[PDB]
Design a protein around this ligand. Structure first.
Ligand SMILES: OC[C@H]1O[C@H](O)[C@H](O)[C@@H](O)[C@@H]1O
Length: 184
């Protein structure tokens, strides 16, 4: 199946619905009023590297001073890819904001420092392939029992607060995923 048809679940964190240049519908945030804090602070800033019709995705966020996450129902077995979108709209030095990302307890991104990787007010995406088959989740070579729901967690450490800007899951493999342009 082609791209928009292959997307099973997608969220614009801290914001309203938005359809991107690829036809992907990022839904209004289901955690509004529930857990964490929404911020539109980035709406004052141009976002580098992102396509300009879609910068609203990176200008809105959900963050928190304690660990928080999203629960995702997955109906059918198959191969999937999770895409996580971020931007640093406040700090402009390394080791100011740093956090881990976990999937059903497995640490899939260790010590994420958005500024260190891309700079200030600039798009950064993480791309995480996975498989759900024979009652198991498989990610980065580790395997555990899958019950029907995936728990995506952003973990509080010592350096400022965990955050996320947007996220989506598509059926397919990594070669099917649109990539951001190369960046120094
Ligand atoms: O709202 C502006 C900023 O407030 C806090 O510093 C948050 O930890 C940060 O993620 C956010 O970008």
């Amino acid at each position: 199946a082609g791209l928009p048809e292959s997307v099973i679940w997608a969220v614009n964190a801290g914001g309203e619905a938005h359809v991107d240049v690829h036809g992907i519908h990022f839904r209004k945030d289901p955690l509004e009023g529930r857990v964490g804090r929404a911020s539109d602070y980035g709406m004052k800033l141009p976002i580098l590297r992102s396509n300009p019709e879609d910068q609203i995705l990176y200008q809105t966020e959900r963050y928190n001073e304690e660990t928080f996450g999203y629960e995702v129902p997955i109906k059918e077995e198959g191969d999937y890819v999770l895409v996580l979108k971020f931007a640093e709209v406040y700090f402009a030095q390394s080791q100011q904001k740093v956090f881990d990302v976990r999937l059903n307890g497995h640490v899939v991104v260790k010590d994420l420092d958005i500024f260190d990787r891309v700079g200030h007010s600039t798009a950064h995406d993480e791309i995480i392939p996975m498989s759900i088959r024979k009652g198991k989740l498989s990610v980065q070579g580790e395997v555990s029992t899958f019950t029907g729901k995936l728990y995506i967690e952003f973990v509080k450490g010592y350096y400022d607060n965990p955050k996320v800007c947007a996220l989506y899951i598509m059926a397919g493999t990594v070669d099917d995923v649109p990539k951001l342009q190369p960046h120094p």
